[PDB]
From Swiss-Prot, chain A:
InterPro entries cross-referenced by the UniProt entry: NA-bd_OB-fold, Ribosomal_eS28, Ribosomal_eS28_CS
Signal sequence interval, chain numbering: none
Gene Ontology cellular-component terms listed: cytosolic small ribosomal subunit
CDD domains per the UniProt record, alphabetical: S1_S28E (cd04457)
Matches recorded under NCBIfam families: PRK04007.1
Superkingdom, taxonomy of origin: Archaea
PANTHER family on file: 40S RIBOSOMAL PROTEIN S28 (PTHR10769), SMALL RIBOSOMAL SUBUNIT PROTEIN ES28 (PTHR10769:SF3)
Keywords for this protein: Ribonucleoprotein, Ribosomal protein
An example Gene Ontology molecular-function term: structural constituent of ribosome
UniProt-listed PROSITE patterns: RIBOSOMAL_S28E
Pfam families: Ribosomal_S28e
Protein name: Small ribosomal subunit protein eS28
Swiss-Prot/TrEMBL GO biological process terms: maturation of SSU-rRNA; ribosomal small subunit assembly; translation
Curated annotation (Swiss-Prot), chain C:
Ribosomal protein keyword on record: yes
The protein's assembly and partners: Part of the 30S ribosomal subunit.
Biological process, per Gene Ontology: ribosomal small subunit assembly; translation
The protein's name: Small ribosomal subunit protein eS19
GO molecular function, one term: RNA binding
Lineage: Archaea, Methanobacteriati, Methanobacteriota, Thermococci, Thermococcales
Role, per record: May be involved in maturation of the 30S ribosomal subunit.
Database matches in InterPro entries: Ribosomal_eS19 (IPR001266), Ribosomal_eS19_archaeal (IPR027548), Ribosomal_eS19_CS (IPR018277), WH-like_DNA-bd_sf (IPR036388), WH_DNA-bd_sf (IPR036390)
Similarity remark: Belongs to the eukaryotic ribosomal protein eS19 family.
Curated annotation (Swiss-Prot), chain E:
Single GO MF annotation: rRNA binding
Record keywords, A-Z: Ribonucleoprotein, Ribosomal protein, RNA-binding, rRNA-binding
Gene it is expressed from: rps7
Domain of life: Archaea
InterPro entries: Ribosomal_uS7 (IPR000235), Ribosomal_uS7_arc (IPR026018), Ribosomal_uS7_dom (IPR023798), Ribosomal_uS7_dom_sf (IPR036823), Ribosomal_uS7_euk/arc (IPR005716)
Name under which the protein is recorded: Small ribosomal subunit protein uS7
Keyword flag Secreted: no
Any Pfam family the entry gives: Ribosomal_S7
GO CC terms in record: small ribosomal subunit
Entry's family note: Belongs to the universal ribosomal protein uS7 family.
The protein's assembly and partners: Part of the 30S ribosomal subunit.
Function description: One of the primary rRNA binding proteins, it binds directly to 16S rRNA where it nucleates assembly of the head domain of the 30S subunit. Is located at the subunit interface close to the decoding center.
Curated annotation (Swiss-Prot), chain G:
Entry keyword annotation includes DNA damage: no
One MF annotation (Gene Ontology) recorded for this entry: rRNA binding
Subunit structure: Part of the 30S ribosomal subunit. Forms a loose heterodimer with protein S19. Forms two bridges to the 50S subunit in the 70S ribosome.
Entry's Gene Ontology cellular component terms: cytosol; small ribosomal subunit
Keywords tagged on the record: Ribonucleoprotein, Ribosomal protein, RNA-binding, rRNA-binding
Family matches, as Pfam families: Ribosomal_S13 (PF00416)
InterPro entries: Rbsml_uS13_C (IPR027437), Ribosomal_uS13 (IPR001892), Ribosomal_uS13-like_H2TH (IPR010979), Ribosomal_uS13_archaeal (IPR019977), Ribosomal_uS13_CS (IPR018269)
Name of protein: Small ribosomal subunit protein uS13
GO annotation, biological process: translation
HAMAP family per the UniProt record, alphabetical: Ribosomal_uS13 (MF_01315)
RNA sequence: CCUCCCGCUCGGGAGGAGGCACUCUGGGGGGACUGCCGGCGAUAAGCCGGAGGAAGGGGCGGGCGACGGUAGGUCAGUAUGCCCCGAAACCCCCGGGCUACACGCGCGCUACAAUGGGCGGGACAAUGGGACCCGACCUCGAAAGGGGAAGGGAAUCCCCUAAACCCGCCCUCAGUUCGGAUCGCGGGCUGCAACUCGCCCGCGUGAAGCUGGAAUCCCUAGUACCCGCGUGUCAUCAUCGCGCGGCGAAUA
């Protein structure tokens, strides 16, 4: 394929969980791609994802989020 | 002399070992050469049973154990040196078989 | 420098089954493939190989075992029969291909009945084999 | 699912560090030799636990706060 | 039978299934590198127990993962050499044992046409058969959304291999496509991203329906 | 020469192995390694023997007797024991640590083997219930 | 080869295909798959080749092993019906003899007034037990013998 | 050391002496306890992560189910209050019925083929059960089975062969060489006796079914999925119930 732009983002911290099916786990990510670099985004990451995993972002303009919380 | 086999089984663990140990201790010192008390298998008996008398819903099912253990003893002594050693009290409930050959 | 132990059973069986055509003492009797066959066959095959394999096994099995019986070699083959929708079960072969076979070997001098009640190899059944395996184990190193 | 040591196990290791505190150590097996001789051995598995807690109760007594 | 023994001299040295060197390929993407057991060695059957831990299933030999998602379909009924089956399916109503043969013959049938190390055609078919984006009908806060959810490298692999293994059994259905073949003609065309892979038709649609909804 | 007797046990295929010096003997239940029909579980046995080398395989006689039900079961009991037969032989931590980094099925068995079939509520298999449809 | 045909006629005018000799006779009612390979032996042909590779001379060797099989060999449990209606020793069955012999014995019972003949008329297995709800959802066994 | 076979004379295999090493058997003992190390937490409890290790943080699988309730289930196992029967709602007998079917559903087996079928060969288990009982082995019979007969009241003998496996060969995707219903016949076996109403073996016969709507069930690892194996009760009806080992995951 043509690339799109692969906007690699490595996750920095795993804030908690979202989805009613539970399915999304919201993870905060830091970017390592040739255009932006460094940007802090709070993306909806599914499936098993550890700390320090890599996630190819499809669109760079996103950040969907709903937050709270442990007591 | 006459090589005798004491074949001794019991339904429970505590009863069989005390007799096997005592038989190897009293026989040791007299006119007896004795080969050691060898353990053969537990023919563990499984009875596998339906609890509930309705046979209804879920019925939880009892597993049963009857474990019968067999020690065996060869001995070289007389028929008179045999009864002297068969004096012992013996648990209820302990079968002692005697084959006699030369 | 070989036994029946050293040769794979896929290469041993067409080398002994040929050596049962060639010698040429053991042969197919006509009644045994016709319809006196073992349990049910999807088709009945018109083969010499068919007779020569049911016997080429029999000289390997009596080697391993001592008192190897008729009821053992009937039950040793592997194969079933339908009951219906009830699932299949384990049955034994035709005793006709096993009780004439041991007796075609017995006249050949390859097998003999022992006096303890059973079936064992002779030296002539034991040497017929070690020569056929010395030829097979030698060929298995030549061939990459 | 979840782990928590029973209260019989803690009642017992607590008073066993109370009577003879100085005949206990920060080795597992030694305390385990001592616990054997003081209170009953109803079995082997519990006899490792009480001993497991007593060792932690000597680590905390050094700190200054022991509960 | 003699080639078979050459296939026993050759895996020894070291190579998968008798004659495929595990060095021929490399994982060029640093995403699918820790998630794949291309690098380790010899046999899939292994019985190394997985799902034991958090990611006790990432270290699974790529082919073993293939074998048991290729083994999947299976109830009740009874198999033996007798008259006797089906019971082991269009996908092993039964074992990884007669499964491992299918994948071996499919490595044989994909090597016969392409002529490459087939472990370079399959690892090229499990980086393309995985969709890069998925929509979950996810509601959070009582509010029903159908949302942008990006896919994790572990849950990628799984959708790659499973969609490869789901496509073949629609085609093998009472058809000359043997799974040793129907898989070998799925693995070439999922490697290529061809318009004939029921496994690269869902990959796309799952990203494309998921782009609309975002 | 020497006699170092070891064991190798996986899912109740118990392999009885012996490693003495000689000329490249591979005996399994009396028959050479050649008699087996699956190519596959052979290669499994063969894994350790190359990780160390053919040098030590050729110089040493290995007889094993694997009394175990599985075809792959036999092989697996053969994979664990050769590897342990070769680590006792040379003695070094080089051949032991080289096995552990590759796989732990060379030098650890299992902690578990099999579970009983539970009594259950009148059906077939340990973990299953009768089908319901009374709602 | 022995002279290719796609349709040779065997067992009268009924047709022999191009499937395999052992499967082409199975169809001809009376000769099955085990009885086809019993008449390949006596006659002297290769069993696994295609059907239709037969000169005229092979087609005559089969038609006389059929008329009387108990003359050529064929054991007295390996022939089609042994001990017939209490006074025939052995016979042959073919599409006309099998159709007649089985309807005859059924014509016999209905007059006898048995629990076998009227149990073949109402719509039932006799010894297979359940008529309780099997042949379920309007369905039917088709009893004897052919819905193709 | 000794008997047998083979040999390229290097060397492979069996038997018996011999030897208890090994597997194993069953009785006892140690080992795992958040002990230690880091992080989160009130420095407490606890959760997470790490090392060493055969095994780890309820290690893992069972038994173990409070006070009670649904007037749940059983007086048709027994025990038992009350009522009822008294040539009978007793008692004995043969025969028939429970196995009747236009149909409806529940729980299951078998199944719609090339990951296949035949044929042959080879490498593999475990729980168990075995005296009018398991039956070596030898013989006759196509076989089911029959005749003879060793051992065995049991780690020492028998059922017994595992099945899945793999390798070569024949076969070449059709309602078929699938699938086995239904029907004719020949034949065994138990009991007084298997038509109603047994199972198997052989030949002939050869049905529906070519992946299933609405709807809905089961389970989370040596598990499911899969393959055979035994036992109970027991002559004989097992596609059942209980239990064993072989292959060996998905997702959480």
């Amino acid at each position: 394929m043509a690339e799109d732009e692969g906007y690699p983002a490595e996750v920095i911290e795993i804030i908690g969980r979202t989805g009613t099916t539970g399915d999304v786990t919201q993870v905060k990510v830091r970017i390592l791609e040739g255009r932006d670099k460094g940007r802090v985004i709070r993306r909806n990451v599914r499936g098993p994802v550890r700390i320090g995993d890599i996630l190819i972002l499809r669109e760079t303009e996103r950040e969907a989020r709903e937050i709270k919380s442990r007591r | 002399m006459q090589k005798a086999r004491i074949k001794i089984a019991s339904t429970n663990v505590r009863s069989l070992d005390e007799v096997a140990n005592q038989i190897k201790q009293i026989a040791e010192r007299t006119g007896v050469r004795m080969s050691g008390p060898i353990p053969l298998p537990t023919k563990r008996i499984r009875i596998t049973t339906r609890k509930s008398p309705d046979g209804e819903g879920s019925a939880t099912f009892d597993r049963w154990e009857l474990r019968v253990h067999k020690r065996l003893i060869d001995i070289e002594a007389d028929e008179r040196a045999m009864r002297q050693i068969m004096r012992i009290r013996v648990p209820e409930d302990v079968t002692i078989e005697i084959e006699l050959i030369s | 420098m070989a036994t029946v132990y050293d040769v794979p059973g896929d290469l041993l069986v067409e080398r002994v089954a040929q050596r049962l055509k060639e010698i040429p003492e053991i042969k197919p009797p006509e009644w045994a493939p016709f319809v006196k066959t073992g349990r049910h066959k999807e088709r009945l095959p018109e083969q010499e190989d068919w007779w020569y394999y049911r016997v080429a096994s029999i000289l390997r099995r009596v080697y391993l075992d001592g008192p190897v019986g008729i009821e053992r070699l009937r039950t040793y083959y592997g194969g079933r029969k339908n009951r219906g929708h009830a699932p299949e079960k384990f049955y034994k072969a035709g005793g006709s291909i096993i009780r004439k076979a041991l007796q075609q070997l017995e006249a050949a001098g390859f097998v003999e009945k022992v006096p303890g009640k059973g079936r064992v190899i002779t030296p002539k059944g034991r040497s017929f084999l070690d020569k056929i395996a010395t030829e097979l184990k030698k060929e298995l190193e030549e061939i990459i | 699912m979840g782990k928590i040591r029973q209260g019989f196990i803690k009642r017992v290791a607590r008073e066993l560090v109370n009577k003879y505190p100085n005949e206990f150590t920060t080795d597992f097996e030694h305390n385990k030799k001592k616990v054997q001789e003081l209170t009953n051995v109803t079995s082997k598995k519990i006899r490792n636990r009480i001993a497991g807690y007593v060792t932690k109760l000597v680590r905390m007594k050094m700190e200054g706060k022991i509960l | 039978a003699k080639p078979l023994n050459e296939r026993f001299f050759i895996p020894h040295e070291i190579k998968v299934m008798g004659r495929w060197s595990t060095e021929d390929v490399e994982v060029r993407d640093p995403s699918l590198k820790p998630y794949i057991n291309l690098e380790p060695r010899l046999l899939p059957h292994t019985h190394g127990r997985h799902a034991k831990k958090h990611f006790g299933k990432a270290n699974v030999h790529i082919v073993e993962r293939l074998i048991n998602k290729i083994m999947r379909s299976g109830g009740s009924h009874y198999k033996v050499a007798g008259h006797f089956m089906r019971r082991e399916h269009r996908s092993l109503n039964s074992k990884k044992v007669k499964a491992y043969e299918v994948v071996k013959e499919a490595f044989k049938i994909i090597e016969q046409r392409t002529g490459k190390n087939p472990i370079q055609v399959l690892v090229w078919a499990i980086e393309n058969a995985a969709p890069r984006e998925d929509t979950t009908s996810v509601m959070f806060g009582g509010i029903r959304y159908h949302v942008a959810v990006d896919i994790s490298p572990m849950r990628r692999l799984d959708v790659a291999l499973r969609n490869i293994a789901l496509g073949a059994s629609a085609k093998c259905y009472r058809n000359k496509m043997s799974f040793a073949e129907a898989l070998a003609e799925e693995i070439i065309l999922a490697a290529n991203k061809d318009p004939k892979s029921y496994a690269y038709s869902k990959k796309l649609e799952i990203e494309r329906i998921a782009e609309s909804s975002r | 020469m020497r006699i170092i007797q070891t064991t190798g046990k996986r899912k109740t295929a118990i392999a009885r192995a012996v490693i003495r010096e000689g000329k490249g003997r591979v005996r399994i239940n009396g028959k050479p390694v050649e008699i087996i029909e699956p190519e596959i579980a052979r290669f499994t046995i063969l894994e350790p023997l190359i990780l160390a080398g053919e040098e030590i395989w050729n110089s040493v006689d290995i007889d094993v007797k694997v009394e175990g039900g599985g075809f792959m079961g036999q092989a697996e009991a053969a994979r664990m024991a050769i590897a342990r037969a070769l680590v006792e032989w040379t003695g070094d931590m080089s051949l032991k640590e080289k096995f552990m980094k590759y796989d732990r099925t060379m030098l650890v068995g299992d902690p578990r083997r099999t579970e009983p079939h539970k009594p259950n509520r009148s059906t077939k298999g340990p973990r299953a219930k009768r089908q319901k449809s009374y709602r | 080869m022995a002279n290719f045909r796609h349709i040779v006629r065997v067992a009268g005018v009924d047709l022999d295909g191009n499937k395999q000799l052992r499967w082409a006779l199975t169809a001809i009612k009376g000769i099955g798959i085990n009885f086809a390979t019993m008449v390949c032996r006596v006659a002297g042909l290769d069993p696994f080749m295609k059907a239709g590779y037969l000169t005229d001379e092979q087609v005559k060797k089969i038609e006389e092993i059929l008329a009387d099989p108990v003359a050529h060999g064929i054991p007295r449990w390996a022939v089609n019906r042994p001990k017939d209606y209490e006074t025939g020793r052995d016979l042959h069955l073919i599409t006309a003899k099998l159709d007649m012999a089985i309807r005859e014995d059924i014509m016999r019972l209905r007059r006898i007034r048995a629990y076998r003949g009227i149990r073949h008329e109402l719509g039932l297995p006799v010894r297979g037990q359940r008529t309780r709800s099997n042949f379920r959802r309007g369905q039917t066994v088709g009893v004897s013998r052919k819905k193709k």
